[PDB]
Design a protein around this ligand. Structure first.
Ligand SMILES: CCCCCC/C=C\C=C/CCCCCCCC(=O)O[C@H](COC(=O)CCCCCCCCCCCCCCC)COP(=O)(O)O[C@@H]1[C@H](OC(=O)CCCCCCCCCCCCCCC)[C@H](O)[C@@H](O)[C@H](O)[C@H]1O[C@H]1O[C@H](CO)[C@@H](O[C@H]2O[C@H](CO)[C@@H](O)[C@H](O)[C@@H]2OP(=O)(O)OCCN)[C@H](O)[C@H]1N
Ligand SMILES: CCCCCCCCCCCCCCCCCC(=O)OC[C@H](COP(=O)(O)OC[C@H](N)C(=O)O)OC(=O)CCCCCCCCCCCCCCCCC
Ligand SMILES: CC(C)CCC[C@@H](C)[C@H]1CC[C@H]2[C@@H]3CC=C4C[C@@H](OC(=O)CCC(=O)O)CC[C@]4(C)[C@H]3CC[C@]12C
Ligand SMILES: CC(C)CCC[C@@H](C)[C@H]1CC[C@H]2[C@@H]3CC=C4C[C@@H](OC(=O)CCC(=O)O)CC[C@]4(C)[C@H]3CC[C@]12C
Ligand SMILES: CC(C)CCC[C@@H](C)[C@H]1CC[C@H]2[C@@H]3CC=C4C[C@@H](OC(=O)CCC(=O)O)CC[C@]4(C)[C@H]3CC[C@]12C
Ligand SMILES: CC(C)CCC[C@@H](C)[C@H]1CC[C@H]2[C@@H]3CC=C4C[C@@H](O)CC[C@]4(C)[C@H]3CC[C@]12C
Ligand SMILES: *[C@@H]1O[C@H](CO)[C@@H](O)[C@H](O)[C@H]1NC(C)=O
Ligand SMILES: [Ca+2]
Lengths: 104, 184, 331
């Protein structure tokens, strides 16, 4: 994205001298609902499913908010030994259909 | 045995199945609750004495074969029945499927009914413990209102009832033999 | 007139949770005082069992206070802690004292004292008659501490030692000492066994214990160039400001307390020698950065997945064995 920055050069003696210091001020409030920037193209969440003290499930949600482009992601998970995992129960679903990973 | 083991090697070209099966049975590393006597004992153990106690409690299974063969030399099938019951009671990871097998033999020995004592109470106790397993499992694991001591007590009672029942049958057998030889 | 050449300090807090704010506050006050009087941060071994300065429950983050006026922060801007919440235990404390530490332990976390070193030890927590509790699981008895100090004396790892404990019935912890050159102070006697409870409103907890509060107030007036002896710390917090009675044991110690300065144990005063001597001296391929996330290479770095099938030799062996058995019972 094209971004504009204001630069304060502290080595310039026009900016900072012995007789005058620097205090920068900035006016900003939460913008109205309209004119707010769009959400990023990628974000994710993680949670635990079930109840009790015997069995459960670990779930992750991945979002693609781009209008027309698909892109790949690489996912890394580490789990302690006490939570024993069953790999024949692993499922990946997009839009109600099964998604087959290229590498695992 | 030798041929079966050597054949098993060639399925995956490894010897890794052996520690995974027989070492697991002999060493009892997993502490999942069951109807047996090992899990809570080894979850509450002082590390100094663990080796000694595992050795003792796995010798206990193989212990009785020799004296039982000395006494029951002329009655091999009753000997088999007793041995199967002992295996079911004192194994490391027991299940009710192991229990059903020796209960299938009770009709063979029901001509000994007149010499049986305290059969009624033992049957009632076993029946009660069977139903009390799921309710206390629920109260511990889902409700959160109970703890592991309830479940441990139920396992203790179940095993004690089994032992008493087997001892009763053995006594009745010997009493009938005595009356046959010496007179009623 | 002391005869030492360096100073050390070991300050330990053995509490847990957020409602035990007081013990951590006491330890922080001691750390502030000893730093202000001169002992470097590399010669202080600080062990804290829980964090109260950046606990999310703290209404004022990164601060710990001693009084409700909130005019003195004892955590300070400059602080360094060697042992965190899960590495504080009876076993590690005993290892640090006796020197029997795992080989890979760094220098900053060990006590490297010698024959010419004065040491100060301070402890606080929940205790009883003859024991002090670490977190809630374990305890240390007076016999073990008395044994560790004799282990330290036999190798000549100190010159003089000062031991202070702030607990209920704290006098029981110095009864079994039997090594030379140890002086001990306590906040309460064996009978005295209750503890105060006046929570602060704005923060929500009880701030600090009384004895260490008055001891820190008497150490706030002492400066690096002070001539105060150890006879003035024996008259601090009389039963009238506290409700318990402080004690001292000084029969294992060789010097007169009227000749022992406060800075011999709470500060660092060096021995200096002017130097007046001198030694005569004669006058083509560029390099590239790695690629983040190469997709095709990742896909081709692993062979494709084919379904598993039993080997044929195993099948042949099985069926040959079975039929060989069948040809015995039938023919
Ligand atoms: C028929 C022949 C039977 C053969 C053998 C008998 C075997 C089973 C039968 C009966 C039981 C005997 C063995 C039972 C022992 C364990 C079980 C137990 O007692 O616990 C209680 C279970 O309740 C029951 O037993 C009955 C409920 C249903 C079961 C029915 C029984 C069988 C029925 C089958 C047939 C019925 C009808 C059939 C006929 C048709 C649960 O209570 P609780 O947990 O609250 O109490 C415990 C504990 O209590 C005991 O165990 C009793 C002690 C001796 C019992 C042994 C019996 C003697 C002889 C029996 C005779 C039987 C006949 C034999 C002859 C043939 C114990 O006192 C405490 O130590 C224990 O801890 C306590 O738990 C709680 O206590 C603490 C305080 O709350 C607490 O500790 C924590 O908190 C403290 C802070 O103050 C701390 O200081 C502690 O460090 C600690 O840690 P903390 O910081 O809190 O950390 C917390 C983190 N979680 C404990 O937490 C707390 N749980
Ligand atoms: C994989 C499993 C391995 C099987 C090994 C392959 C050999 C099969 C043998 C066929 C059964 C069989 O022999 O029937 C008849 C058997 C043996 O003959 P017999 O008349 O008793 O003669 C010897 C005496 N004297 O007579 C008997 O002794 C009667 C008992 C029958 C044995 C059971 C039949 C085997 C079939 C498999 C069933 C197993 C269940 C699974
Ligand atoms: C038939 C009964 C009475 C005993 C005879 C059966 C033998 C053919 C088997 C049974 C157990 C086997 C042993 C079980 C375990 C091991 C450890 C194994 O060591 C490893 O290398 C395991 C780990 C690794 O590969 O690094 C080497 C083979 C050996 C001695 C096996 C050799 C073949 C043995 C003796
Ligand atoms: C019927 C008679 C003649 C022999 C029956 C077979 C057993 C005597 C053998 C067969 C396989 C053996 C086991 C194969 C592998 C191991 C793992 C080996 O190392 C471990 O991993 C031990 C477990 C642990 O200490 O954690 C220890 C012996 C053990 C259990 C062996 C013990 C003896 C076993 C049960
Ligand atoms: C007829 C044969 C089976 C011998 C008679 C039975 C017992 C005299 C022996 C046979 C197999 C032995 C077991 C083989 C393997 C193990 C695992 C071993 O585990 C370890 O050493 C790992 C660490 C630990 O858990 O202490 C403890 C002893 C134990 C149960 C042994 C106890 C003594 C046993 C039951
Ligand atoms: C020969 C059979 C039938 C009966 C003899 C008992 C055997 C199986 C048992 C009895 C005592 C046992 C030993 C007891 C303790 C130890 C120490 C440690 O190293 C683990 C195995 C080891 C060395 C055991 C090996 C198996 C053992 C020798
Ligand atoms: C900074 O100080 C110099 C020297 O006094 C002065 O000339 C200059 O005007 C000061 N800053 C400004 C306003 O540029
Ligand atoms: Ca330090």
């Amino acid at each position: 994205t094209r971004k504009t920055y204001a630069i304060y050069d502290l080595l310039d003696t026009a900016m900072i001298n012995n007789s005058r210091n620097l205090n920068i001020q900035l006016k900003w409030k939460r913008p109205p609902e309209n004119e707010a920037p769009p959400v990023p193209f990628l974000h994710a969440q993680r949670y635990v499913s079930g109840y009790g003290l015997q069995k459960g499930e670990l779930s992750t949600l991945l979002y693609n908010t781009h209008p027309y482009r698909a892109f790949p992601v690489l996912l890394l998970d580490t789990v302690p030994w006490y939570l024993r995992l069953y790999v024949h129960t692993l499922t990946i679903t997009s839009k109600g259909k099964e998604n087959k990973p290229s590498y695992i | 045995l030798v041929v079966i083991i050597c054949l098993s090697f060639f399925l995956l070209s490894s010897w890794d199945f052996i520690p995974a099966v027989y070492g697991f049975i002999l060493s009892v590393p997993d502490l999942t609750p069951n109807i047996g006597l090992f899990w809570y004992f080894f979850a509450e153990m002082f590390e100094h004495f663990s080796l000694f106690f595992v050795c003792v409690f796995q010798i206990n299974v193989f212990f009785y074969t020799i004296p039982l063969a000395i006494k029951l030399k002329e009655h091999p099938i009753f000997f088999m029945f007793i041995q199967i019951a002992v295996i079911a009671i004192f194994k490391s990871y027991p299940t009710v499927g192991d229990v059903a097998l020796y209960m299938a033999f009770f009709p063979v020995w029901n001509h000994l009914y007149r010499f049986l004592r305290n059969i009624f109470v033992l049957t009632c106790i076993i029946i009660v413990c069977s139903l009390l397993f799921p309710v206390l499992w629920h109260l511990w694991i889902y409700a959160g209102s109970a703890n592991s001591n309830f479940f441990y007590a139920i396992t203790l009672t179940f095993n004690v009832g089994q032992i008493l029942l087997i001892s009763d049958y053995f006594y009745a057998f010997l009493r009938r033999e005595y009356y046959l030889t010496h007179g009623l | 007139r002391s005869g030492h050449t360096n100073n050390w300090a070991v300050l330990v807090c053995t509490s847990r949770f957020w409602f035990n704010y007081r013990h951590v506050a006491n330890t922080l006050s001691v750390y502030r005082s000893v730093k202000r009087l001169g002992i470097p941060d590399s010669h202080i071994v600080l062990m804290l069992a829980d964090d109260m300065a950046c606990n999310p429950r703290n209404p004022k983050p990164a601060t710990v206070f001693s009084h409700k006026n909130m005019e003195l922060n004892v955590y300070g801007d400059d602080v360094e802690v060697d042992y965190r919440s899960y590495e504080v235990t009876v076993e590690n404390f005993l290892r640090v004292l006796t020197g029997r530490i795992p080989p890979s332990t760094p220098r900053s976390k060990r006590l490297l004292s010698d024959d010419r070193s004065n040491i100060l030890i301070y402890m606080t927590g929940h205790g009883g008659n003859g024991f002090l509790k670490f977190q809630d699981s374990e305890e240390i008895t007076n016999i073990e501490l008395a044994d560790a100090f004799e282990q330290m004396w036999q190798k000549r790892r100190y010159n003089e030692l000062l031991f202070i404990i702030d607990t209920c019935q704290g006098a029981s912890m110095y009864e079994r000492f039997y090594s030379p050159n140890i002086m001990a102070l306590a906040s309460s006697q064996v009978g005295e066994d209750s503890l105060s409870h006046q929570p602060d409103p704005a923060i929500g907890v009880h701030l600090m214990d009384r004895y260490t509060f008055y001891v820190l107030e008497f150490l706030e007036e002492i400066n690096p160039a002070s001539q105060t002896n150890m006879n003035d710390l024996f008259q601090v917090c009389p039963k009238s400001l506290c409700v318990s009675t402080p004690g001292h044991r000084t029969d294992l110690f060789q010097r007169d307390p009227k000749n022992v300065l406060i800075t011999d144990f709470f500060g660092s005063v060096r021995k200096v020698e002017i130097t007046t001597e001198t030694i005569k001296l004669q006058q083509m391929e560029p390099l590239k950065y790695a690629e983040q996330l190469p997709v095709a290479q990742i896909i081709h770095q692993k062979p494709k997945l084919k379904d598993w099938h039993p080997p044929g030799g195993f099948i042949l062996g099985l069926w040959a064995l079975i039929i060989m058995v069948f040809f015995k019972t039938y023919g």
